[PDB]
Amino acid sequence: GLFDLKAAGFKDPLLASGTDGVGTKLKIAQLCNKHDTIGQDLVAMCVNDILAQGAEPLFFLDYFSCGKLDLSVTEAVVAGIAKACGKAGCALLGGETAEMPDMYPPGEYDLAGFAVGAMERDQKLPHLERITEGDVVVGIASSGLHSNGFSLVRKIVAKSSLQYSSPAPDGCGDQTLGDLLLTPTRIYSHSLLPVLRSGHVKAFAHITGGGLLENIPRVLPEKLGVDLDAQTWRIPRVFSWLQQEGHLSEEEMARTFNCGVGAVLVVSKEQTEQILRGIQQHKEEAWVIGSVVARPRVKVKNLIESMQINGSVL
Amino acid sequence: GLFDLKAAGFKDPLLASGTDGVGTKLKIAQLCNKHDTIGQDLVAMCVNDILAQGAEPLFFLDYFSCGKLDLSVTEAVVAGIAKACGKAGCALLGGETAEMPDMYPPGEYDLAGFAVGAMERDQKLPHLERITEGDVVVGIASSGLHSNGFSLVRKIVAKSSLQYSSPAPDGCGDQTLGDLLLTPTRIYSHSLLPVLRSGHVKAFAHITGGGLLENIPRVLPEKLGVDLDAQTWRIPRVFSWLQQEGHLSEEEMARTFNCGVGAVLVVSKEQTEQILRGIQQHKEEAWVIGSVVARPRVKVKNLIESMQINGSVL
């Protein structure tokens, strides 16, 4: 289909676009034959990425390249993408499935996603000029691992006392380890857009590859960093299991995983309360996780302490 | 970057989009270590596809997923994409390279491309209501194989008396067989847009997967087909070499390969001459290759005859 910006109600739009992939999270989907929500990871990654620029997602396309797959696997992938597009509030405008046995072994596939969004010229983000020392960092809860760090995840599972089919560790639901690890990326595009539209968000960072350390600097003025404290948010228990199993340092955790924070907003102190109110009303979970500070550029205090499980508590 | 439709000069745009891939043409690039023009295949595929809807390409994004690659291979891929975008006249707005050793063996990569275009509401194609029996089919020359049929190509080379490093067969240039097979897809977006903008093109089909037989019906009214005659265009010699080596039937050739025709236009008889004049002035090559007829939906007369090399002619 062709997209009609006028019918969509834009007066003077700028267009944002981005491409993303699920990474080796797909290998776990393929190992466990659990493909229903991998389309949500793909769509969420693309729409959350353009949300960061201040854009409302308009439409999405995927390129689905694969070895020989079961009919039921091909269908489950594609249906989950359609489902995720409905959830995000964007149109599935096209796609391609390209079967290439010489490129991929039986049962393996890759996904590339593309999303296009739009906003008014004045609705654009970040507003770098507005960001100052003492500004507040708001963290939005992730659903878990989202779609990054899965090369490390798969290495840890491979040497662990648990298999993907094992019960998920203490405090990770009545599901298998595979189910837990496959928990789909949260879509923030529909719930957080009115919050961005308030005009009191100075910047938005979607937390993806490179974790908290790599993604936050991209939306800060050159001379500023951020001081974060991990005691101020809830760390999903999957991150504790992983740290313990792989004996992971703070740095490794902060560079690889979202650690519970799927997205960050920069807001002034004065505007903090109404932002938190706005987020809560749109059914997301959020905390003040730190502050913008003079100038490591991002510091994550108390990460291991905050996620380490007390061995005398059952 | 963000795209500014206003600055670009659109009054009332519709947006066209599409995703495409190079297919197993990439395997030949990887086998021969010849990656300089694979980016042109990718970009050409995406821009020629939106050209078909009547759109001017605005911008392009790629997702580049790979095993461990040489630094020089990664760079050559990416530079060829940048180069192709300049040629097509569209902006390279973004991209991602995702190295995943567990997904791809050393030296193997895949490409997904995404292009967005725009045109006026009245500049849209096809104009299905306008197409009638007796309308003319204009064929635009391909540069060769373009980017489809490469699973069959690689099978034929694998059993042939020629290797990719062998001299290219009689009448295929002073280059290797690999060089010939890698000849990049022609970009039609910059040269053929003014022709589409004339308002005398009823429809455009880019000839890709499924060849002449699959791609032309998509732009015809339900009750109409097309009668083509292969004696009316030049068939590049690569197609003769392939037919002979694989002992390929007319049907196999017409369903797999473009056979010399990279794109088709539907035009009225009255408007034929000025269209041919328009194409020639924009430095493309074209012929009247057939006509729209009542209702196999697409017929390709004289394909093997027209491409068979006379054995008594040296």
Side-chain angles (χ1 to χ4, degrees):
Chain A
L2 298 164
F3 202 92
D4 186 339
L5 288 156
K6 201 178 215 193
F10 291 93
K11 312 228 230 159
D12 193 16
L14 302 176
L15 302 173
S17 43
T19 182
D20 247 294
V22 182
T24 63
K25 187 165 193 182
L26 298 183
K27 216 105 179 84
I28 307 191
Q30 298 155 10
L31 283 159
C32 311
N33 194 13
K34 282 157 180 206
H35 307 272
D36 295 2
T37 64
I38 218 78
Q40 183 171 321
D41 295 301
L42 183 69
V43 174
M45 287 302 291
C46 300
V47 304
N48 286 347
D49 276 353
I50 58 178
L51 181 69
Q53 311 164 54
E56 169 182 1
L58 305 179
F59 65 82
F60 176 87
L61 285 87
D62 67 282
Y63 190 86
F64 180 16
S65 50
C66 58
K68 304 164 190 303
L69 298 185
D70 279 352
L71 293 176
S72 57
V73 169
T74 299
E75 294 180 353
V77 175
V78 170
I81 296 168
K83 288 186 222 134
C85 284
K87 297 190 188 193
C90 77
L92 178 61
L93 258 205
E96 189 156 328
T97 300
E99 186 180 318
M100 301 172 282
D102 289 337
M103 206 81 154
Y104 297 94
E108 190 188 295
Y109 60 85
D110 199 25
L111 286 166
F114 308 93
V116 172
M119 83 295 247
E120 249 59 57
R121 185 171 271 100
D122 60 33
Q123 283 163 354
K124 186 258 181 181
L125 307 179
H127 302 278
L128 282 186
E129 348 71 80
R130 302 184 188 171
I131 295 161
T132 201
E133 170 152 73
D135 275 344
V136 171
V137 182
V138 178
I140 314 291
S142 70
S143 60
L145 281 147
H146 286 191
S147 299
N148 285 96
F150 278 85
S151 162
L152 181 57
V153 177
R154 296 158 45 243
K155 292 195 165 76
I156 288 172
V157 177
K159 323 190 238 190
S160 73
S161 61
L162 305 182
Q163 184 54 282
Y164 295 105
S165 54
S166 295
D170 297 314
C172 296
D174 290 355
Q175 56 181 341
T176 73
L177 179 62
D179 293 332
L180 170 74
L181 300 175
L182 284 168
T183 303
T185 306
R186 285 189 78 91
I187 300 163
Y188 297 126
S189 275
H190 180 70
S191 58
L192 296 193
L193 192 69
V195 181
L196 305 197
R197 292 279 185 267
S198 68
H200 304 292
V201 181
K202 292 169 183 194
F204 184 103
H206 178 218
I207 304 302
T208 59
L212 295 173
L213 305 181
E214 227 146 274
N215 292 292
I216 303 168
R218 267 132 79 277
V219 300
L220 299 167
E222 174 74 327
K223 298 189 196 168
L224 305 176
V226 139
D227 269 3
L228 301 182
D229 182 352
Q231 303 257 37
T232 66
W233 72 88
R234 195 227 303 110
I235 305 171
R237 279 95 147 218
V238 65
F239 302 109
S240 324
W241 184 78
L242 292 162
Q243 187 279 317
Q244 279 143 17
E245 283 288 313
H247 298 83
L248 299 185
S249 67
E250 305 214 318
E251 163 126 62
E252 176 138 39
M253 292 308 291
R255 219 177 45 207
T256 314
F257 303 123
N258 70 58
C259 302
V261 182
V264 151
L265 310 185
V266 174
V267 305
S268 75
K269 298 182 209 180
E270 297 70 26
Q271 296 292 327
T272 282
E273 183 55 23
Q274 229 46 61
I275 287 287
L276 294 183
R277 284 171 193 196
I279 296 160
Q280 173 188 67
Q281 291 174 10
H282 286 88
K283 303 166 170 167
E284 302 290 341
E285 195 174 14
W287 307 271
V288 168
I289 59 165
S291 69
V292 185
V293 67
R295 280 170 80 179
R297 197 154 176 207
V298 178
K299 292 178 204 191
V300 191
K301 207 198 160 197
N302 304 312
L303 191 58
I304 305 304
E305 296 84 338
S306 160
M307 83 174 57
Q308 263 175 347
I309 300 309
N310 187 322
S312 300
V313 173
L314 85 86
Chain B
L2 298 164
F3 202 92
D4 186 339
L5 288 156
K6 201 178 215 193
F10 291 93
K11 312 228 230 159
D12 193 16
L14 302 176
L15 302 173
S17 43
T19 182
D20 247 294
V22 182
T24 63
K25 187 165 193 182
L26 298 183
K27 216 105 179 84
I28 307 191
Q30 298 155 10
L31 283 159
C32 311
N33 194 13
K34 282 157 180 206
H35 307 272
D36 295 2
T37 64
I38 218 78
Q40 183 171 321
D41 295 301
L42 183 69
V43 174
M45 287 302 291
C46 300
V47 304
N48 286 347
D49 276 353
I50 58 178
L51 181 69
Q53 311 164 54
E56 169 182 1
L58 305 179
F59 65 82
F60 176 87
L61 285 87
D62 67 282
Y63 190 86
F64 180 16
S65 50
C66 58
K68 304 164 190 303
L69 298 185
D70 279 352
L71 293 176
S72 57
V73 169
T74 299
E75 294 180 353
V77 175
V78 170
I81 296 168
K83 288 186 222 134
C85 284
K87 297 190 188 193
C90 77
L92 178 61
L93 258 205
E96 189 156 328
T97 300
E99 186 180 318
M100 301 172 282
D102 289 337
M103 206 81 154
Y104 297 94
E108 190 188 295
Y109 60 85
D110 199 25
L111 286 166
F114 308 93
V116 172
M119 83 295 247
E120 249 59 57
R121 185 171 271 100
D122 60 33
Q123 283 163 354
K124 186 258 181 181
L125 307 179
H127 302 278
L128 282 186
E129 348 71 80
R130 302 184 188 171
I131 295 161
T132 201
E133 170 152 73
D135 275 344
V136 171
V137 182
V138 178
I140 314 291
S142 70
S143 60
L145 281 147
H146 286 191
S147 299
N148 285 96
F150 278 85
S151 162
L152 181 57
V153 177
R154 296 158 45 243
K155 292 195 165 76
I156 288 172
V157 177
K159 323 190 238 190
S160 73
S161 61
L162 305 182
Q163 184 54 282
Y164 295 105
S165 54
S166 295
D170 297 314
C172 296
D174 290 355
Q175 56 181 341
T176 73
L177 179 62
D179 293 332
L180 170 74
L181 300 175
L182 284 168
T183 303
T185 306
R186 285 189 78 91
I187 300 163
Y188 297 126
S189 275
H190 180 70
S191 58
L192 296 193
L193 192 69
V195 181
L196 305 197
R197 292 279 185 267
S198 68
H200 304 292
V201 181
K202 292 169 183 194
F204 184 103
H206 178 218
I207 304 302
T208 59
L212 295 173
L213 305 181
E214 227 146 274
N215 292 292
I216 303 168
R218 267 132 79 277
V219 300
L220 299 167
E222 174 74 327
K223 298 189 196 168
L224 305 176
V226 139
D227 269 3
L228 301 182
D229 182 352
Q231 303 257 37
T232 66
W233 72 88
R234 195 227 303 110
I235 305 171
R237 279 95 147 218
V238 65
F239 302 109
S240 324
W241 184 78
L242 292 162
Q243 187 279 317
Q244 279 143 17
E245 283 288 313
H247 298 83
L248 299 185
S249 67
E250 305 214 318
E251 163 126 62
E252 176 138 39
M253 292 308 291
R255 219 177 45 207
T256 314
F257 303 123
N258 70 58
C259 302
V261 182
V264 151
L265 310 185
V266 174
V267 305
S268 75
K269 298 182 209 180
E270 297 70 26
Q271 296 292 327
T272 282
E273 183 55 23
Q274 229 46 61
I275 287 287
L276 294 183
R277 284 171 193 196
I279 296 160
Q280 173 188 67
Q281 291 174 10
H282 286 88
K283 303 166 170 167
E284 302 290 341
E285 195 174 14
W287 307 271
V288 168
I289 59 165
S291 69
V292 185
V293 67
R295 280 170 80 179
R297 197 154 176 207
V298 178
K299 292 178 204 191
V300 191
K301 207 198 160 197
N302 304 312
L303 191 58
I304 305 304
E305 296 84 338
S306 160
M307 83 174 57
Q308 263 175 347
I309 300 309
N310 187 322
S312 300
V313 173
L314 85 86

